[PDB]
């Protein structure tokens, strides 16, 4: 017997999935009824599932799900999509996307460096064990900061709770190493190279983070921390959600 808030509760989702965070996921934005970088997301999700010993449902199954989801909210310019894989479980959902105010891309947001660490074994996978990231964001919100930053076991700053951090300093856009290989950040790097900007990767500690931070992710595009450097205005423009 199993009770939820006093009331008997039946089956539905497997225990591993519900009780143990035993899943991998990804989140995409759809714009004009077209998901951004669908292939990249499915290729990553498949890699993550396989690395954690989950069967991947196959692209066709997700494409099928997408046929229904894309029409779920006809009055919204954009959608937030989530694709989630667990043993016995393909969970695909959609909700209206609510863009940040444009003024946040012009004026920038704040970040909070937290003391929370990524998992040494899971940090490179987008998994249901998300508490360290949720906790980091909770800490950040406690100061109205937009994003919280996490560390590895060595004290490097390696990730945001839901965005990938970049640092612009000297003449150079740096991608912080050590965390999730974010799709948005790789596209940003690609676009920055495409514009003749200097792009490099590096492992950073908090004391090395001098210059302008930015945050990339499927939920936000490219979001500057504090007022952006002028050199990156066009790069930010290019990744602004098309949702106004």
Ligand X SMILES: *Cc1c(COP(=O)(O)O)cnc(C)c1O
What number of other Cβ atoms are within 10 A of residue 106's Cβ?
12
Site for its own copies in 85-124 (CB under 8 A): 88-95, 115-117, 119-122, 124
Assess 197 for contact with its own copies (CB under 8 A): no
Across the strands, what pairs with 95? 80
Q: 61 and 83 in contact (C-beta within 8 Å)?
A: no
Total residues in contact with ligand X, by rule CB under 6 A: 17
Q: What is the DSSP string of 90-129?
A: EEEEEEE--PPPTHHHHH-B-EEEEEEEPPTTTTTS-BS-
Near ligand X in 92-151, by CB under 6 A: 126, 133
Candidate ranges 3-11, 53-61, 89-97, 158-166; the one touching ligand X (CB under 6 A): 158-166
Q: Does 159 bind ligand X (CB under 6 A)?
A: yes
Sorted by sequence, the CB contacts under 8 Å of residue 35 that are 6+ apart come out as 28, 29, 41, 66, 70, 81
> Helix (H, G, I), strand (E, B), or coil: what is residue 59?
helix
Binding-site residues for pyridoxal 5'-phosphate, in ranges, read: 44, 183-184, 218
Query: Out of its own copies, ligand X, none, which partner does residue 77 contact, by CB within 5 to 8 A per kind?
Result: none
Nearer to its own copies, 140 or 228 (CB): 140
State both tokens at 190: 């690609």
Stretch that binds ligand X, among 56-64, 68-76, 93-101, 177-185 (CB under 6 A): 177-185
Taking CB under 8 A as the criterion, which residues in 126-185 touch its own copies?
127-135, 138, 152-156, 177-178, 181
DSSP 33: T
Site string for ligand X, 26-65 (x = CB under 6 A): -x--------------------------------------
């Amino acid at each position: 017997m199993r009770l939820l808030n006093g009331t008997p509760l039946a089956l539905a989702l497997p225990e591993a999935f519900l009780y143990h965070g035993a899943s991998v996921f990804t989140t995409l934005r759809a714009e004009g009824g077209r998901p951004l970088w669908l292939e990249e997301h499915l290729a990553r999700l498949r890699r993550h599932a396989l690395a954690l010993g989950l069967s991947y449902p196959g692209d066709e199954a997700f494409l099928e799900d997408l046929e229904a989801l894309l029409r779920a909210f006809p009055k919204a310019p954009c959608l937030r999509l989530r694709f989630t894989v667990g043993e016995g479980v393909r969970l695909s959902e959609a909700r209206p996307y609510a863009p940040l105010p444009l003024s946040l891309y012009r004026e920038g947001v704040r970040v909070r460096l937290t003391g929370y660490r990524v998992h040494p074994d899971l940090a490179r996978y987008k998994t249901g064990n998300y508490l360290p990231y949720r906790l980091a964001l909770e800490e950040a919100r406690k100061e109205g900061a937009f994003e919280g930053l996490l560390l590895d076991a060595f004290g490097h700053v390696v990730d945001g709770s839901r965005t990938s951090p970049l640092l612009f300093r000297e003449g150079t856009l740096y991608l912080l190493e050590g965390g999730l290989e974010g799709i948005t950040r790789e596209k940003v790097a690609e676009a920055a190279r495409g514009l003749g900007l200097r792009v490099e990767r590096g492992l950073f500690r908090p004391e090395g983070l001098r210059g302008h931070l930015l945050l990339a992710g499927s939920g936000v595009g490219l979001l500057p921390v504090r007022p952006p450097p002028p050199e990156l205005l066009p790069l930010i423009e290019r990744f602004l959600p098309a949702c106004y």
